[model samples]
Target: STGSATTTPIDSLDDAYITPVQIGTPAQTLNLDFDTGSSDLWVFSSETTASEVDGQTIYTPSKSTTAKLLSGATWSISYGDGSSSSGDVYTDTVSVGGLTVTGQAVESAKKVSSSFTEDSTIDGLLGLAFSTLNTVSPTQQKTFFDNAKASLDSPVFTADLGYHAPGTYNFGFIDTTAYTGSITYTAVSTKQGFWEWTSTGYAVGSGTFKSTSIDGIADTGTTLLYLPATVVSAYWAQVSGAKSSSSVGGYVFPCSATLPSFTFGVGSARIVIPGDYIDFGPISTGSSSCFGGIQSSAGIGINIFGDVALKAAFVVFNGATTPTLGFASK
Candidate 1:
């Protein structure tokens, strides 16, 4: 079966993308961020402490007759952003668009970090990565995609992110019209439990393409583009007045600097990110200095092709006999 869902940018920063998901028998709908960076379908719940609730909508499993507690199962995740959440597990009917996954594990949060409580735009995260990354203890559960894969026409999903606008996430089948030219396909290493792939090469601005294989993950959850220091520096060096500031954090430049478009090779296909997208926004309101969308991932261990890079193309997470990633310009 094929499924389709509309995703909306939560804020001006495109901080995250929100998609509606139906959980439980009564179909309690929550605006969740479908993240491919990690594997845990976690949510704010009635079990969470009131102090940590903030403005987020909570999922009350008791209200759904079909919800059943998964005995002795629990999960915890510490994200790259330093935010973490821990929760118990429950099996319930979970649906996105028209596709349904019965008895899907719905992790109910008992504890959440301050950053999560502070961000009210997202109620939870529906991890689209491999279930191997699931953090549940004693009994790790399958992710929504993993559970639905058998029934899906194709065991794959597509993320069509937008720039300061709403996008779409399609499940089961690919929409050829959503992208231009032919899709470039590459192998995905699931051993790391990530949608990880190696790029053929990359080019900054009008520079010649660098022929080097760069390993990275196609993370829809992360906010910015993070690459190796050498690659990050090369891109920033082209921009006038660009400098790394410890006080401001990472790289920042005056809004007046001309940012060059970034291009990365997926086999023979080249997906380009416009310069305008690289100029994230002013460091602070009324400030002339803006942050660079691309930053160094030297400390992050692995490079991440996050929202900044993702928004420029249509990305396919193909989970067939062997996982592969397909990229195409939109």
Candidate 2:
């Protein structure tokens, strides 16, 4: 049997998408961000200090009869944005959509950075990248998908992320009604425990598609699309008032400027991000400057096709031997 879940965008913050996940035996439901960038299922829990709790819904293992501690196991994780969380581990039943997994590792956060505690809406993160990326100590953990894959009709999941609207994530089966035209498949290199692939090239607007090779990750957790510095400059050059701003961080342009569409190559298939998607809203409140959705991947080394880019297409995360990525226009 297959399972599917609805993914909704957080109000105001159009950065991440959240979905409901049931954890523990009594079924403590929490809205979690289904992140394809990392592989650790972590959450705010009773273990967290009261001061750090804020408005987050905490998970209490003591209330679940099936919850079991892993004795000496612990986990710590940090993201590219410098946000971090760490704490002890517990084994419990975790369910997403209609798929259930027993004895899944649930990292209970005792300490969380301001980025996590301040947001409050997201209870935790469900990692969908690969089991190898799990950060548990003493013994690595398996993601919800890894534990439930054996029971699925097929080892595949499709991400239909939408902009300013609710989307759906389907597991074990592909929904033809969600996408248009044919899906273009490309070989993926999973050595880094991420859906990493080399894009043939990219271009800004109706410009020529350069044959520059770009290695990047399809990261759903990241909010913006990150590319090489040169490519970012090339794209911004088309925008009349675009300029690099140290105060704002990354490239920014006049809010009224007309932005051009950006395109990325996947083998022979081209995925186009409309011009409107490139404008990432104002840099700050009441500011006439707006940040570009696409930025530089300088220190990160690898480009990230985050939610900003992913929302423009339907993506298939194929977990079969010789894992591949299939992209189709939404």
Candidate 3:
């Protein structure tokens, strides 16, 4: 079977792309961030503390006649951004677009971080990463992709992200017109249960390509593009009035700074991220200092080709016996 879902950037800054997912019998639809970096499908539920819900929608398992508590199952997840949530588990009929998975494991949040509560736009997260990374204790659960792969026409899913616009997530099949030119497939290392791969190299603005093997994961959940300090510094240096100040954290520059394009190689293809995309919104409301979309991974420990890099092209996360990643110019 095949499925297609529309994902829209939660904010103008392209902070995160969220898609609607229907859960349980009566089908309570919630907007969830499809995170390719982690493996846990969690949501705010009726079991959550009222104070932690804010304006986000909560899933009521009791409302769904098909819902059943996963006996003794519990889950806890912490993100790289330090935000976290924990809760018990349930199994229900979950649907995405036209795809359906019976008895899909769904984590119901009993507690959530302050950031998650305040950010009402994100109701929950739908992890697309390998199930080996699932946080459920006692027993690990399968991801939506993992549960549906065998029945799919093709054992793959694609992410076509947009810049402040609605994008598409295609499962079981790839949309030919969704991308241009040919796709460059690369070997993926699933050791860490991430869609990890090695990028050929990168080039800043019109600069010559630097031949380097940059290892990273394609993370749709993260907002920025994190690279090596050397590469990050080089990109920032090209922008005037840029500095790594402690004032706003990481790196910041004049909002009016003339930015340069960022390009990364995937096989023989060179995907370019337009300059304006790198100039993320202002540090604060009406502030002159703008935070850059590209930052150093020195603090992150792992380089991440997040939304900044993801929106620049079409991506495929193949869930095969020998998983592989495919990047195409769009």
Candidate 4:
């Protein structure tokens, strides 16, 4: 059966979207970050040391009769943001929206980085990337989507991350009513286990679109848009008082600057990000300096079209065959 799930933004942060998911026999519910950048379904659990567990909810295997430990199995993951977690594994019933998968591997966190430990609102992460990226040792595990795809009417999901608003994540079906105009499809290269694609070029404001090819990944879990240093430099040049500040980190500009909109090309379609969205609010309270939402990918090697970029359009993660990505105006 087809299924759909609504994802809610976490307050005004707009950093990540959280969805409620059920796990195990009796159904222990947890709000999880649906991440498209990685593949590993892990949770704060009874295995986690109390010191590492702050206000986050922990999953207890003892409460679920169906929970069975995957003997000698373990998993660990480190994100581009430096956040990390490692844990033992268990197989149990897992459900998202109306779809359920029996014997889904659930990594029980034994350790978590400070970034995750400090952000206690999210109990875990439901990775939507290819199962090839799963961190399970000895034997890698399949993602929830992978396990449930065969039963779905279509092996696809859509991410409509909103700007300071709630969005929906639909599984097994694409609601045409949610998007306007035609969906421009792009061939995705999953060699890296990410929804990686190459953009023909980009334009700053209404300037002529340049023809520089840039490869990047569409990552919902990342908060900012990361591009090449040269591209980032060009965008900041348009802002009068913008400067790269080591103190502020990345480029910072006056909060009142008249920023230009940035547009990226996908085939013949252009997705424009509003100028206001590029100003990532003030760097600190009572400070006139505001950090830029677009920064240099530099050391990361690959550019990241994070939430800052994805929220500007409707994104479809098509998994039916040779994974493809579809973008359209919202």
RMSD of each: 0.8, 1.0, 0.7, 1.1
Q: Model 4: which ten-residue window has the lowest total lDDT? A: 8-17
Candidate whose lDDT is highest: 3
State the displacement of the C-alpha of residue 201, model 2, in Å, after optimal TM-score superposition.
1.2
Pick by lDDT: 1 or 2, better one: 1
Error of 3 at 78 (Å): 0.6
lDDT of each: 0.93, 0.91, 0.94, 0.91
State in Å the error of residue 295, model 4.
0.5
Question: What is candidate 1's lDDT per residue for 1-330, written digit by digit as tens?
Answer: 989999999898798999999999798999999999999999999999889988888899999989999999999999998999998999999999889999999999999999999988889999998999999999889999999999999999999999999999999999999999888899899988999999988999989999889999999999899999999999999988999988997999989888899998899889999998887889999999999999999889999999999999999999898989999999
Q: What TM-score does each of the candidates earn?
A: 0.98, 0.98, 0.99, 0.97
Better of 3 and 4 by lDDT: 3
Given candidate 1, what's the lDDT at residue 95? 90
Q: Any runs in candidate 3 off by more than 4 Å, and if so which?
A: none
Candidate 3 per-residue lDDT, tens place, 133-196, comes to 9999999999999999988999999999998899999899999999999989999998998899
Question: Higher lDDT: candidate 1 or 4?
Answer: 1
Stretches off by above 4 angstroms in model 1 are none
